[PDB]
Amino acid sequence: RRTKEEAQETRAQIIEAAERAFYKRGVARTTLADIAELAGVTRGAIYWHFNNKAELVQALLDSLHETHDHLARASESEDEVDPLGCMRKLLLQVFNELVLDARTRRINEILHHKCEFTDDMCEIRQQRQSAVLDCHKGITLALANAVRRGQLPGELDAERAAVAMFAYVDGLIRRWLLLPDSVDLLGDVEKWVDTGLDMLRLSPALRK
Amino acid sequence: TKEEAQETRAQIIEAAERAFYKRGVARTTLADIAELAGVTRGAIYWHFNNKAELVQALLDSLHETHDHLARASESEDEVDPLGCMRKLLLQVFNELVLDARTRRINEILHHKCEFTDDMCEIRQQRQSAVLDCHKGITLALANAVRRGQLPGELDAERAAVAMFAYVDGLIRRWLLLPDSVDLLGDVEKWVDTGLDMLRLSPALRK
Ligand SMILES: Oc1ccc(/C=C/c2cc(O)cc(O)c2)cc1
Numbered sequence: 001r002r003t004k005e006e007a008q009e010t011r012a013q014i015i016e017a018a019e020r021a022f023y024k025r026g027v028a029r030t031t032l033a034d035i036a037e038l039a040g041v042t043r044g045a046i047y048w049h050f051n052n053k054a055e056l057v058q059a060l061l062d063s064l065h066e067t068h069d070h071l072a073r074a075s076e077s078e079d080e081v082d083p084l085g086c087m088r089k090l091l092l093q094v095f096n097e098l099v100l101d102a103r104t105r106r107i108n109e110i111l112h113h114k115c116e117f118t119d120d121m122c123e124i125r126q127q128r129q130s131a132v133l134d135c136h137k138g139i140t141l142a143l144a145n146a147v148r149r150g151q152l153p154g155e156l157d158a159e160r161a162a163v164a165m166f167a168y169v170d171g172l173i174r175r176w177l178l179l180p181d182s183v184d185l186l187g188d189v190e191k192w193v194d195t196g197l198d199m200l201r202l203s204p205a206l207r208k
Numbered sequence: 209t210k211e212e213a214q215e216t217r218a219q220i221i222e223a224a225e226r227a228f229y230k231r232g233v234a235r236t237t238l239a240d241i242a243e244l245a246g247v248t249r250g251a252i253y254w255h256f257n258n259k260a261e262l263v264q265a266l267l268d269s270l271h272e273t274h275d276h277l278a279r280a281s282e283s284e285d286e287v288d289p290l291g292c293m294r295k296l297l298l299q300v301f302n303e304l305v306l307d308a309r310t311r312r313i314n315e316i317l318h319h320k321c322e323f324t325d326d327m328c329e330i331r332q333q334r335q336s337a338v339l340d341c342h343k344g345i346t347l348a349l350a351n352a353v354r355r356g357q358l359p360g361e362l363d364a365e366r367a368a369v370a371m372f373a374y375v376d377g378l379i380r381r382w383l384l385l386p387d388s389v390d391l392l393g394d395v396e397k398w399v400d401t402g403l404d405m406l407r408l409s410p411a412l413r414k
């Protein structure tokens with residue numbers, strides 16, 4: 001109809017086909033030409049939207065923020081009266097979306113288990129570094145806010161606590177992707193979130 | 209001869225580490241590895257049925273250093289099982305940071321090895337290996353519980369999952385962003401942060 005609307009539809013068809021192809025065959029051996037054929041678009045069209053497969057990987061990775069942005073910004077705001085509470089809701093939502101949404105599950109499985117870091121495509125590792133560094137910044141801000149509001153210990157090492165928490169969450173996600181039946185991540189989602197928050201609130205090793 | 213076969217196998221393993229680390233698992237073939245190792249006339253296929261088996265050899269190689277401390281933590285006659293586990297985890301992080309071989313293998317497993325349907329054995333062998341680690345961790349913690357070193361109502365299974373998640377995530381964080389974690393200089397605090405989760409979180413109780 002209109003150029004932009006047609007372009008948005010094409011882009012979304014490609015991204016969806018990229019998910020399916022990376023998920024079955026992996027990033028290393030999938031080409032844009034392969035994804036174009038699975039999306040039912042021309043090679044000219046796919047290369048118009050994405051210059052290389054690293055950009056297509058980044059589009060998938062960037063798409064994981066959208067759902068959580070509301071709660072993340074709230075937990076990071078200094079004006080929030082209950083920053084720790086926003087973090088808990090954020091973490092529940094992170095796990096809930098991972099188990100229930102096929103798309104989110106698929107993308108995380110791509111990023112964890114179907115995407116390699118090779119100097120052949122150095123930007124895949126550089127983008128991952130940027131993404132994690134950025135999430136670390138946000139976590140540190142929300143923990144520092146929680147400390148200032150009396151919700152976490154006064155001498156918490158916010159930086160180290162932020163690493164601890166991300167490690168725990170990232171490991172649990174990867175474990176659930178590898179062995180879903182090993183973890184009732186949905187039925188016990190509150191215990192899994194609270195286990196991680198307990199570490200930050202109670203461990204003396206995380207204090208200055 | 210035994211010696212020359214064992215030496216050829218080792219040369220292949222070290223070559224596989226170099227090739228996988230540079231180009232990744234997905235696109236590296238056994239023939240490429242043999243070319244890098246300088247092994248000829250089909251030698252690699254006598255030592256490894258396929259590429260998955262060679263990946264499993266690298267992962268299996270990580271257990272050797274820690275087997276003593278791991279088995280001790282699992283022994284029902286061990287009087288200090290949690291101390292053996294703390295010694296274990298300190299060694300895991302020290303080796304990661306100090307040993308080029310261990311770091312490089314972990315970077316391969318975490319960041320340079322796809323799981324594909326074409327080669328389903330990689331994912332299945334990783335499942336079995338994590339399940340075996342989890343079985344051992346659970347026995348260590350149950351031992352620690354039995355010996356009054358962790359809370360009597362600890363859910364040993366969920367605790368074992370939590371400890372593994374934290375450790376696995378921290379390694380992977382250190383591999384991606386080394387300068388964000390003083391893993392060696394602060395090793396004791398990183399190990400105790402995780403142990404504190406098990407010792408202290410009410411959410412891991414039954
Ligand atoms: O405070 C926190 C807020 C968010 C998170 C999310 C971590 C995460 C790690 C992954 O490997 C995949 C993913 O989709 C998310 C962790 C801590």
Ligand SMILES: Oc1ccc(/C=C/c2cc(O)cc(O)c2)cc1
Pocket residue numbers: 270293296300314345371372375376377379
């Ligand atoms: O109690 C525990 C004993 C051992 C471990 C090992 C974890 C681990 C995770 C990795 O991704 C790589 C690795 O080389 C080791 C975790 C907990």
Ligand SMILES: [Mg+2]
Pocket residue numbers: 063064065066067068097104
């Ligand atoms: Mg989302």
Ligand SMILES: [Mg+2]
Pocket residue numbers: 269270271272273274303310
């Ligand atoms: Mg070793």
